[PDB]
Design brief:
This protein starts with a helix and ends with a strand. The chain is mainly beta. Helix content is 6%, strand content 40%. Strand 1 and strand 2 (21-23) form a beta hairpin. The protein binds chloride ion (CL) (2 copies). One chloride ion is lined by residues 90, 92, 120-121. It is found in: Nucleus.
Length: 124
């Protein structure tokens, strides 16, 4: 249940654009190819079997799909923890990326992370 899920992770999860998923918090601006400060997690509020895969993609109007590293994780106890997601492709200082989340239930569901992320060679 959402109340129970919030209660396992108080103060750590944010809405996605889908009522069925929450996520951990990403930086607003990060350095290309740098390890993230908070390992990314996608949390299912609904039933998602263990082993269900989750993949993320990043892009914008200039770049349909920016390079990522380690952009797939598997659900376990309704949480998919990405061990080492990295943002490699750069948005530049003037634009940011939207991060789309795909959860490979049958059939797959798509969610979007709740903020844009800027990726530059130097970072913030
Ligand atoms: Cl790229
Ligand atoms: Cl850049």
């Amino acid at each position: 249940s959402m109340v129970e899920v919030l209660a396992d992770h108080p103060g750590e999860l944010v809405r996605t654009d889908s009522p069925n998923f929450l996520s951990s918090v990403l930086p607003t601006h990060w350095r290309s190819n740098k390890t993230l400060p908070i390992a990314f997690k996608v949390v299912a509020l609904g039933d998602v079997p263990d082993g269900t895969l989750v993949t993320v993609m990043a892009g914008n109007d200039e770049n349909y799909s920016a390079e990522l590293r380690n952009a797939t994780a598997a659900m376990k106890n309704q949480v998919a923890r990405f061990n080492d997601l990295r943002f490699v492709g750069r948005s530049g200082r003037g634009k940011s990326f939207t991060l789309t989340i795909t959860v490979f239930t049958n059939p797959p569901q798509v969610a979007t992370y709740h903020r844009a992320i800027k990726i530059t060679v130097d970072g913030p």
